[PDB]
Design a protein around this ligand. Structure first.
Ligand SMILES: [Cl-]
Ligand SMILES: [Cl-]
Ligand SMILES: [Cl-]
Ligand SMILES: [Cl-]
Lengths: 258, 258, 258
């Protein structure tokens, strides 16, 4: 039917191609550039929105998707996805200001770059994921962190925590030793007595022989037992002496004359 | 005025289009491909640098930006941005070997991929950011780390640290018990005495009754008090007996005759 | 020789250009679009595979690389790299369903986006890396984590671990104090005696003066020494008294008459 270049500055090349708005360019049979400053390249390629660019056969930018850019066979920026950018065959942008990066890629949120993709004939999953490589370590808060950075950051903190736990355990050992020692000092100061050359108990301070207070008590109690017996035995003797003395006095008096 | 294809192998299509260097291609009214192996597609699209490619109306590659690639309406690779790549409408590359990815995107450093973007009519911020989705977990040090990886790596270390702190606290409990027990063993060994059937103090080892050394001392001191009194009382009696005996002897002698 | 548009819906523009399959479009001298729905733009640009798109002079998609998309001077999707996407001058995709993003970029794995690149005249390294900026914090497990997130996540756990170590050290202090105190209570209960107004030993409970059991034992042993001497001395006296009494009795009897 065409080619028909009806817009100002417009160019249309190929059978059926049409460029119908100002500054539109359509190149490829049946391509259509129906937006202002729109560009369509390839067969059946449609750049319908203002400022849209569709590159590759059957690439598509919806007429509502102002500033949409689609590159690759069947790459698409869909309804309401203003400023969408689809990069790769069969990539699809369905969100504003987002990027579907890679063949078969999709978008899921606005203001997003998405590198996951519609899986084909072999996955139970709806979307597959892509590994992202070739990164320098991020420096800014909004830079991507690498696996290397993650490991080093986590490893460093892990070693620092190991180290702190060590210091604290040593502190607790030292503490218990000093606190336990305090009580041991008291025990030692109060529970021993020195023993003399002749067995006399003395202050433990700088003494040759040393014994425990309980042993000293047992031994001293034994001495007391002996003394206790003797005192009772002597008492009996003294009583009998007294009685005999008074009996002698009486007899002396009787001799004298009573 | 044109179209003018003056370079070797050059092609120019559209009113005013020009392709002026070897292997240049300009397609679109007023497009210009002025670099060697340069390609311009769309109205007013300029590929000025050697090996530059500008795709979409008003896309632009500065003549100094050798190897610059710009795709999307108004996408631009600017002065000195050699090997720049602008992907999306109004994307701008101002750094060497960098990529402005997405509509409105910019670059800030050389050797950078940048997915942040010039914000429009509604932000006090100069640049907005984009969330990046669809990643497989990175495996290499220069791979991107995912949120999933970050959480699992940090969570695992966190649990490991919990576990270590537990082991160490239990070690400190066990330690204090054993150290505190040592002193308790000493206290117990030195501060008790066994008590006999008849009250005799003995070694605490395997004794029926047991008392504390201080109680034993108090009780033994009381016995000593009693003995102390008795010894003094007996002494007085013995003194008086002696005096009476000597008096009797004198009287006996007087009876005898002195 | 050409231009030759021999495919259905095909368009070829430029000397030697050829579009030889259904829905193929070749624009640029010596360009070739030899795939179904293939599109080649620029001088010597080859879109050989079905559904391939090659944009920029010398851009190339291998005939086996179905759905390959290459944008930029010399950008290439190579043998067997089906669904490859090369974005930037001299970018090369050698893996299925992968993206070489940026000038000089490469791919290393299938299902990968790669932003590292072949270094040129000044590196001993084969591949350079690119910093990735402009990210919003990831929310999903497959979102990219930012440096900001990594730091905050790691910092928060680090503070939490600090805090836990503090609590546990305080627990160990409190524990040792209470356990050490228990033994101190026992020591104090068993190792002191009260001293009376008149020196009498009593239970330490609510006493004016207090002394240690070992000191009390030493002092009590000294009293016992004194008593021990006295008992022996008194015994000698009592023996002598007895002997004198019996001698007096004998003399009294002799006086009486024996
Ligand atoms: Cl005694
Ligand atoms: Cl006597
Ligand atoms: Cl007498
Ligand atoms: Cl007489």
């Amino acid at each position: 039917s065409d080619a028909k270049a009806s817009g100002e500055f417009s160019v249309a090349v190929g059978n059926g191609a049409r460029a119908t708005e100002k500054a539109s360019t359509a190149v490829g049979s049946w391509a259509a550039a129906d937006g202002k400053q729109s560009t369509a390249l390839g067969v059946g390629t449609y750049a319908y929105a203002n400022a849209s660019t569709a590159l590759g056969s059957v690439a598509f930018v919806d007429n509502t998707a102002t500033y949409g850019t689609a590159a690759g066979n069947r790459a698409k920026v869909d309804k309401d996805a203003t400023e969408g950018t689809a990069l790769g065959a069969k990539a699809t942008v369905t969100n504003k200001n987002s990027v579907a990066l890679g063949a078969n890629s999709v978008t899921t949120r606005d203001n997003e770059v998405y590198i996951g993709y519609k899986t084909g004939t072999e996955s139970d999953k709806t979307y597959g994921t892509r590994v992202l490589g070739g990164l320098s370590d991020g420096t800014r808060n909004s830079d991507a962190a690498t696996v290397g950075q993650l490991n080093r950051k986590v490893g460093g903190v892990y070693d620092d925590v190991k180290a702190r736990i060590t210091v604290e355990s040593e502190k607790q050992k030292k503490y218990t030793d000093q606190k336990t020692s305090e009580v041991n000092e008291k025990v030692e100061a109060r529970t021993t007595v020195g023993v003399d050359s002749d067995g006399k108990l003395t202050r433990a301070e700088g003494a040759t022989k040393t014994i425990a207070v309980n042993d000293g008590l047992v031994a001293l109690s034994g001495r007391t037992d002996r003394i206790d017996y003797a005192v009772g035995a002597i008492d009996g003797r003294v009583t009998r002496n007294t009685q005999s003395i008074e009996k002698n006095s009486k007899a002396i008096a009787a001799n004298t004359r009573t």
